[PDB]
Swiss-Prot record:
Induction: During mitosis. The mRNA encoding this protein contains an internal ribosome entry site (IRES) in its 5'-UTR. This 5'-UTR generally suppresses translation while specifically promoting expression during mitosis, when cap-dependent translation may be impaired.
Family: Belongs to the DNA repair metallo-beta-lactamase (DRMBL) family.
Cellular location(s): Nucleus
Stated consequence of mutating D139N: Impaired nuclear focus formation, reduced interaction with PIAS and increased sensitivity to cisplatin
Function summary: May be required for DNA interstrand cross-link repair. Also required for checkpoint mediated cell cycle arrest in early prophase in response to mitotic spindle poisons. Possesses beta-lactamase activity, catalyzing the hydrolysis of penicillin G and nitrocefin. Exhibits no activity towards other beta-lactam antibiotic classes including cephalosporins (cefotaxime) and carbapenems (imipenem).
This protein's name: DNA cross-link repair 1A protein
Tissues in which the protein is found: Expressed in brain, heart, kidney, liver, pancreas, placenta and skeletal muscle.
Gene behind this protein: DCLRE1A
Source organism of this protein record: Homo sapiens
Superkingdom of the source species: Eukaryota
Length: 341
């Protein structure tokens, strides 16, 4: 059965609630983004209205075969009426297609559901500027001060310079980048662009990227592995064994691999600056772990919430333990006393 923090009071609506069967009195199911924990349950057999972005709609149709009659895409930054209630979708700065949802309740209450998001000062100049929010349903993935990481721009700078240096020293090196879902596409796109190559991948991954409305995509990716010196592989294969095995298949074109594993936060963030990061190396294979986050740092989260000044906060991540829930409630009270709302 569907938990409370996925229901929107005073509406027939749920958010990211497809794994519970038929939800009593749900007339429209919202999906914030195409990540498996959130879409869990959708398929070609689903027969209720799904509301989402255009990009999420492309993935539902082509990857999950959801029938077209039940896909309701909405434009961003635009007031829309759904089942007699005003809603707006806003960019979440998460993965492609990810939204936040503003609901304007018939009784005068305003609710923001962040989905998964990476808070940014640019959100203080969206349609959120205009008015009050009474309840915030918040992506609390990294709600603790130990969670620090650099900007996406610094991480990409590090990856481009690392790849360009290595391939200029050795023109016979191959670059490999891990993936297991959408998001983080800038890692492999920026590397390929500096190297003057398309990105090679499987047919299944090429299909997924074709759903994402990335400009000039046909100029950036390919299924012809032989033509490309930046390859994508599933994340589970980014290890000394998997990469040895991959190099065998390239037909003596390459004598070295340099690989990247994007992660979220890891404990080596607690000591080592992005500049100072070093790889793990065995023979002619080197693997860099790089902390490319699509969720708010503690400081970014705190900034956003202090600016918005919500009356109540409902966390949507780390809700399963008493210690987690208690820790989060203490931070929300400090933020409120410090800023005076
Ligand atoms: Ni996500």
């Amino acid at each position: 059965t569907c938990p409370f923090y996925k229901k929107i009071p005073g509406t027939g609506f749920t958010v990211d609630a497809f794994q519970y069967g038929v939800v009593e009195g749900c007339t429209a199911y919202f999906l914030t983004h195409f990540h498996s924990d959130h879409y869990a349950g959708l398929s070609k057999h689903f027969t209720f209205p799904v509301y989402c972005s255009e990009i999420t709609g492309n993935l539902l149709k082509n990857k999950l075969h959801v029938q077209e009659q039940y896909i309701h895409p909405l434009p961003l930054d635009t007031e829309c009426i759904v089942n007699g209630v005003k809603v707006v979708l806003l960019d979440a700065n998460h993965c492609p297609g990810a939204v936040m949802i503003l609901f304007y309740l018939p009784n005068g209450t305003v609710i923001l559901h962040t989905g998964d998001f990476r808070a940014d000062p640019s959100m203080e100049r969206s349609l959120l500027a205009d008015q009050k929010v009474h309840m915030l349903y918040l992506d609390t993935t990294y709600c603790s001060p130990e969670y620090t990481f650099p900007s996406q721009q610094e991480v990409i700078r590090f990856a481009i310079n690392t790849a360009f240096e290595a391939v200029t020293l050795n023109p016979h090196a191959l670059v490999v980048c891990g993936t297991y879902s959408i998001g983080k596409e800038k890692v492999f796109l920026a590397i390929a662009d500096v190297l003057g190559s398309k990105v090679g991948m499987s047919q299944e991954k090429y299909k997924t990227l074709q759903c994402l409305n990335i400009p000039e995509i046909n100029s950036l990716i390919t299924t012809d592995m032989c033509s490309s010196l930046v390859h994508l592989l599933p994340m589970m294969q980014i290890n000394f064994k998997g990469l040895q095995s991959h190099l065998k298949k390239c037909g003596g074109k390459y004598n070295q691999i340099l690989a990247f594993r994007p992660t979220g936060w890891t404990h080596s963030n607690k000591f080592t600056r992005i500049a100072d990061v070093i790889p793990q190396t065995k023979g002619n294979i080197s693997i860099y772990g790089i902390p490319y986050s699509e969720h708010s740092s503690y400081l970014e989260m705190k900034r956003f919430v202090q600016w918005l000044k919500p009356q109540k906060i409902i966390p949507t991540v780390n809700v399963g333990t008493w210690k987690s829930r208690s820790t989060m409630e203490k931070y929300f009270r400090e933020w409120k006393l410090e800023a005076g709302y």
